[PDB]
Enzyme design. Sequence first.
Site, PDB file in Angstrom:
ATOM      1  N   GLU A 144      37.579  28.355  31.412  1.00 56.71           N
ATOM      2  CA  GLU A 144      36.922  29.694  31.741  1.00 56.71           C
ATOM      3  C   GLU A 144      35.661  29.019  32.418  1.00 56.71           C
ATOM      4  O   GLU A 144      35.185  28.295  31.738  1.00 56.71           O
ATOM      5  CB  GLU A 144      37.337  30.505  30.816  1.00 56.71           C
ATOM      6  CG  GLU A 144      37.262  31.558  30.674  1.00 56.71           C
ATOM      7  CD  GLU A 144      37.901  32.489  29.358  1.00 56.71           C
ATOM      8  OE1 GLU A 144      36.648  34.208  29.572  1.00 56.71           O
ATOM      9  OE2 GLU A 144      38.758  32.533  29.248  1.00 56.71           O
ATOM     10  N   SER A 154      44.206  33.083  36.368  1.00 56.65           N
ATOM     11  CA  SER A 154      43.089  33.811  37.330  1.00 56.65           C
ATOM     12  C   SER A 154      44.700  34.991  37.880  1.00 56.65           C
ATOM     13  O   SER A 154      44.804  36.361  37.843  1.00 56.65           O
ATOM     14  CB  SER A 154      42.848  33.327  38.472  1.00 56.65           C
ATOM     15  OG  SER A 154      41.647  32.688  37.796  1.00 56.65           O
ATOM     16  N   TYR A 184      45.759  38.179  35.956  1.00 54.80           N
ATOM     17  CA  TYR A 184      44.732  39.156  36.011  1.00 54.80           C
ATOM     18  C   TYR A 184      45.087  40.299  37.183  1.00 54.80           C
ATOM     19  O   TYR A 184      44.092  40.971  37.913  1.00 54.80           O
ATOM     20  CB  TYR A 184      42.872  38.852  36.065  1.00 54.80           C
ATOM     21  CG  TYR A 184      43.088  38.735  34.815  1.00 54.80           C
ATOM     22  CD1 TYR A 184      42.294  39.345  33.957  1.00 54.80           C
ATOM     23  CD2 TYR A 184      42.660  37.131  34.840  1.00 54.80           C
ATOM     24  CE1 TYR A 184      41.891  38.674  32.767  1.00 54.80           C
ATOM     25  CE2 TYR A 184      42.319  36.032  33.723  1.00 54.80           C
ATOM     26  CZ  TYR A 184      42.381  37.543  32.399  1.00 54.80           C
ATOM     27  OH  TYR A 184      42.175  37.205  31.354  1.00 54.80           O
TER      28      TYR A 184
HETATM   29  C1  LIG Z   1      32.467  47.048  36.430  1.00 56.63           C
HETATM   30  C2  LIG Z   1      32.450  46.924  38.204  1.00 56.63           C
HETATM   31  C3  LIG Z   1      30.368  47.056  37.835  1.00 56.63           C
HETATM   32  C4  LIG Z   1      31.850  45.082  38.234  1.00 56.63           C
HETATM   33  C5  LIG Z   1      31.775  44.012  37.270  1.00 56.63           C
HETATM   34  N1  LIG Z   1      32.159  42.923  37.509  1.00 56.63           N
HETATM   35  C6  LIG Z   1      32.469  42.344  38.503  1.00 56.63           C
HETATM   36  C7  LIG Z   1      33.317  40.884  38.334  1.00 56.63           C
HETATM   37  C8  LIG Z   1      34.173  41.917  37.317  1.00 56.63           C
HETATM   38  N2  LIG Z   1      35.245  41.357  36.053  1.00 56.63           N
HETATM   39  C9  LIG Z   1      34.588  40.006  35.522  1.00 56.63           C
HETATM   40  O1  LIG Z   1      34.378  39.356  36.052  1.00 56.63           O
HETATM   41  C10 LIG Z   1      36.029  39.326  34.046  1.00 56.63           C
HETATM   42  C11 LIG Z   1      36.798  39.575  34.314  1.00 56.63           C
HETATM   43  C12 LIG Z   1      37.330  39.159  33.272  1.00 56.63           C
HETATM   44  C13 LIG Z   1      39.150  39.132  33.606  1.00 56.63           C
HETATM   45  N3  LIG Z   1      39.272  38.041  34.362  1.00 56.63           N
HETATM   46  C14 LIG Z   1      39.338  38.322  35.394  1.00 56.63           C
HETATM   47  O2  LIG Z   1      39.740  39.750  35.914  1.00 56.63           O
HETATM   48  N4  LIG Z   1      40.303  37.554  36.524  1.00 56.63           N
HETATM   49  C15 LIG Z   1      39.382  36.095  36.344  1.00 56.63           C
HETATM   50  O3  LIG Z   1      40.107  35.274  37.431  1.00 56.63           O
HETATM   51  C16 LIG Z   1      39.623  35.754  35.100  1.00 56.63           C
HETATM   52  C17 LIG Z   1      39.283  33.419  34.506  1.00 56.63           C
HETATM   53  C18 LIG Z   1      38.936  33.539  33.970  1.00 56.63           C
HETATM   54  C19 LIG Z   1      38.608  34.343  32.701  1.00 56.63           C
HETATM   55  C20 LIG Z   1      38.605  35.660  33.109  1.00 56.63           C
HETATM   56  C21 LIG Z   1      39.562  36.439  33.704  1.00 56.63           C
HETATM   57  C22 LIG Z   1      36.891  39.150  31.954  1.00 56.63           C
HETATM   58  C23 LIG Z   1      34.941  39.807  32.323  1.00 56.63           C
HETATM   59  C24 LIG Z   1      35.572  39.244  32.971  1.00 56.63           C
HETATM   60  F1  LIG Z   1      33.428  40.449  32.904  1.00 56.63           F
HETATM   61  C25 LIG Z   1      33.629  43.020  36.442  1.00 56.63           C
END
Ligand SMILES: CC(C)CCN1CC[C@@H](NC(=O)c2cc(Cn3c(=O)[nH]c(=O)c4ccccc43)ccc2F)C1
Length: 351
Positions: free
Chosen positions: A328, A244, A247
């Site tokens: 994950e 995490s 990111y």
């Molecule tokens: C675009 C906006 C309307 C907000 C929408 N989402 C809020 C959550 C944000 N992204 C995620 O949850 C997310 C984040 C990631 C990347 N990621 C990440 O950014 N943080 C993590 O801790 C993580 C952990 C395990 C796997 C991926 C992680 C990949 C795909 C995703 F969908 C986008």
Amino acid sequence: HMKSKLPKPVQDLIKMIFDVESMKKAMVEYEIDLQKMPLGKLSKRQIQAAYSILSEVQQAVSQGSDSQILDLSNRFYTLIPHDFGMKKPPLLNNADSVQAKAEMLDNLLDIEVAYSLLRGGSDDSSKDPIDVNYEKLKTDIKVVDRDSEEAEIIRKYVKNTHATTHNAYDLEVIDIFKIEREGECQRYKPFKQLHNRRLLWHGSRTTNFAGILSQGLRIAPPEAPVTGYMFGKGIYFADMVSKSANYCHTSQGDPIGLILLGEVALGNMYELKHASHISKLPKGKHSVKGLGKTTPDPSANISLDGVDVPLGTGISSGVNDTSLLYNEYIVYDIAQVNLKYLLKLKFNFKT
Ligand SMILES: CC(C)CCN1CC[C@@H](NC(=O)c2cc(Cn3c(=O)[nH]c(=O)c4ccccc43)ccc2F)C1
């Protein structure tokens, strides 16, 4: 102004996440032109429109030429201007280009919320702007005491789950915040007693956190290309802190990072070894688990307010041919998340 009676850690947090130059610095990292598309001109319908053009590029990539791809690639750069001069910009012709621009647009929606809060609402010179911006988050932020039991558990979770493959840095905990978003505990109520509730990490760059703390962790909209995400469009968590932490996108140019610890109602987990671009779970499943090669020791689990904390040292999981080095967790209903803590981290880069 009155000078603000918030604790000093909470005041520095508010400065950090509402920093306007940091949002601009984030946008230029994605190669966006602030001359043509500045922070003020940013909006949701432009980002959703861009998502849709990215979904068309997804379509052409999945069915195979560079002639038609050129047209679809240029229409994307029309909606979200990039800084290439008199250019010929780089062609968006593969899955990596789709994923990379999807993760940018992910960040742009969080920045738009942060800035809209900043330029929405009222202007009182007699109030401290730290207090003004704190109220716009609609989140109670309290500083956790360093000697408390919850502080000891959290620091141990950070300490024990840093992976060997992410040893270019290590982490000091500066501040631990207990957080409570408005109406989230009410939204969580159907899942509060569900089996397999786990305290898991979610890292993001600091420019996303005003958006996260106001709107919560969200799902990417229908317009977004589902191919751009490994396990489709949900909310992603990890049980290893370093996974995490990556990111946050810290570097030698700002390793002060922010990371969440949320309660995630996993329930019956749909376990997977490789990418599966789904927009709905199979019947009876409440979450996806991307099966890691390494996993925190199951015997060393610990409870914190009746929520499991997988803070054991990383060991072999016994899973063979998986894409993932580490675990994950994904949920596809925003009501399955209850954010409990926020940590401000200190990335000691040894390179
Ligand atoms: C675009 C906006 C309307 C907000 C929408 N989402 C809020 C959550 C944000 N992204 C995620 O949850 C997310 C984040 C990631 C990347 N990621 C990440 O950014 N943080 C993590 O801790 C993580 C952990 C395990 C796997 C991926 C992680 C990949 C795909 C995703 F969908 C986008």
